[PDB]
Design a protein around this ligand. Structure first.
Ligand SMILES: CCOC(=O)[C@@H]1CN2C(=O)CCN2C12CCCC2
Ligand SMILES: CCOC(=O)[C@@H]1CN2C(=O)CCN2C12CCCC2
Ligand SMILES: [Zn+2]
Ligand SMILES: [Zn+2]
Ligand SMILES: [Zn+2]
Ligand SMILES: [Zn+2]
Lengths: 360, 360
């Protein structure tokens, strides 16, 4: 059995479990069950499953070097799939809510969930709530007797909290911190003093890296009962690095990828987002380039968005990117090396994560 | 130490813990810490604390009849307060998100959180996410070594899931089930075939009763290590009953309480809500009264909302209410009686919940 085909089979099994429990215990009717089914499929399916498959891949890694009965291999893979799905659905929660928060139009070349005609924001906000509740329903049902249950549940919450904290950092990133105040409508930054590497890094680490890289790697370790075969500080550091690289690619794509090939129309310029382009561009601009940037950033007006793009194009940020790229290729390989001291297997699983991030 | 003054002290201690952990582990800056502090106070404080205080009251009940060292009494009360706060903050999550979902204007005579000038919906949706994450942060920190930790965590999730399911039932209550479909914009019901006692009951049970009545009673039991001194099926049934009564009062208040004395301007008529008034009114209307109701329900137009009110006024629903009241006074007292077989203390704690619901 190919890993993907296992993963996907477990989706069906998990879906059937959740909906049948809704009928037997939560008094649901068939039409509401269908609604929730369509919501689950529309919001959890259709991506690459990079996060969920990472849990499966790390588990498979350890299977190849650890003695187990066949039924134990099966059990561990079924746990890897279930934990995988917890993370996918946790992402779906965040994608649903974030698309509402930001007033987004599309993702994966289809409309945001809230924009479906029969959904609306009133239902979608609560649909996103349910998606994350399902992660806990999954975990208590399938992992009830597992020795890893508490470590797994405790890890998952802290990543979830961290992500919501990252979300806060992100949607506040175009404000001046010293002006934050619930009483007072928040003006956009005029000095851009807080568009720095360290501030950028903080947004990305909390908003993305913990849920996309750390969570899947460490869940792989928990369901395999293999946490003591890695140095957890290394796992965190390599996760940070790959996570940050991932986002920098995703920031360069918002600006320069055709909207058709991005699965969405990019708005980072017009949302005044603390992207890697703006931070890096402000790291090398002259006075006059900075003044022009400020007059044109965070304006929905397309003439001005052409101006920020022209400034970025003229700025030669590709050279800054290859240099960042090179250093990250450097640093990840050092971390992989350090990871081979304890688990060669694990370090290989990190290498595979790194390749799939480094290409796309 | 009065119970309230204990509860409130623990709020300060919990708040300080959460914000200091944000600084030491989540890299937060002082202005974002202040923002979150103001958000916590504005969204968790200002009510009666009926739910949180119930956990404290049930625990105190058992203290009076169980032998413990003084430090154990203290510990149990501090757990009751912490668990209490988990429920208050879980409510705050739901109130924040629901006010956004429904486009509400006020609660407790102050603006909804999303409407504060420095917040906005983009931040408030994620603020509500954080509120519920804090419940889990609280629980893992304060209850890490507690024998009740897993039962507590497992109960809390299922109530949370149940509530979000109740929310779905509620916002879909004015639709025809057989028409639900994410692809198709949902028309309001024309026949009102689904405004029945049983359908009403389902909305209320999931949306309110589990989080308002069941959760606090059973959390009281868990932190007191007293679950085997009650018959859990009785606890559930008495919770259902009081929960439903609570909502019926809250449905009569939406229509007939001055907006000043409700802490909000009522919209159940105009939202086409499955209230106890509409269900009960449709349980005794003649053909002509039903036709008029249908022409006037779910329309923001005030002339028509005067017409639904005039129909309800003429319908003599007060008589239907005293009869429902009487039966519930009947049935709760039977359940209290059955609850005295095992725990007299517990049954008294349920009696107190019942009095505070039955007055206000
Ligand atoms: C496996 C160990 O991981 C951690 O300790 C991270 C690093 N730290 C933070 O920056 C916020 C709290 N904590 C985390 C808890 C889980 C995700 C965030
Ligand atoms: C203490 C036992 O309580 C239950 O079994 C209820 C009753 N039942 C439902 O209707 C949905 C699932 N389950 C609950 C789980 C917790 C809240 C909802
Ligand atoms: Zn966003
Ligand atoms: Zn992007
Ligand atoms: Zn609502
Ligand atoms: Zn109401």
């Amino acid at each position: 059995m190919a890993s993907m085909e296992r993963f996907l089979s477990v989706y069906d099994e998990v879906q059937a479990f959740l909906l049948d429990q809704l009928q037997s215990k939560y008094e649901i009717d068939p039409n509401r069950a269908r609604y929730l089914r369509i919501m689950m499929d529309t919001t959890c399916l259709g991506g690459k499953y990079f996060r969920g498959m990472t849990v499966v891949n790390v588990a498979e890694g350890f299977l190849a070097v650890t003695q187990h009965d066949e039924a134990t291999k099966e059990r561990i893979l079924h746990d890897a799939c279930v934990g995988g799905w917890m993370i996918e659905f946790l992402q779906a929660h965040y994608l649903v809510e974030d698309d509402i928060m930001d007033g987004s139009v599309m993702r994966r070349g289809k409309p945001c969930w809230y924009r479906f005609p029969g959904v609306t924001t009133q239902c979608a906000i609560n649909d996103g709530i349910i998606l994350k509740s399902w992660t806990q329903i999954m975990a208590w049902h399938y992992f009830a007797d597992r020795p890893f249950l508490k470590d797994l549940l405790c890890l998952f919450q802290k990543v979830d909290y961290a992500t919501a904290v990252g979300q806060m950092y992100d949607v506040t990133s175009m404000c001046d911190s010293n002006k934050l105040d619930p009483e007072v409508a928040q003006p956009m930054t005029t000095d851009f003093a807080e568009f720095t590497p360290a501030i950028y890094k903080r947004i990305v680490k909390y908003k993305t890296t913990f849920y996309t890289y750390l969570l899947p790697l460490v869940m792989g370790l928990l369901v395999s009962e293999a946490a003591a075969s890695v140095e957890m500080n290394l796992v965190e550091r390599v996760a940070h690095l790959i996570g940050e690289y991932f986002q920098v690619q995703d920031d360069v794509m918002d600006c320069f990828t055709p909207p058709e090939q991005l699965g969405k129309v990019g708005t980072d310029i017009e949302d005044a987002k603390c992207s890697w382009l703006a931070v890096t561009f402000l790291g090398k601009a002259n006075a006059a380039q900075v003044a022009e940037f400020k007059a044109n950033y965070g304006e929905k007006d397309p003439a001005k968005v052409a101006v920020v793009k022209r400034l970025y194009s003229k700025a030669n940020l590709q050279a800054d990117f290859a240099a960042y790229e090179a250093e990250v290729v450097r640093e990840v390989e050092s971390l992989i090396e350090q990871l081979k001291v304890k688990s060669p297997t694990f370090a290989e699983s990190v290498a595979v994560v790194w390749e799939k991030t480094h290409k796309r």
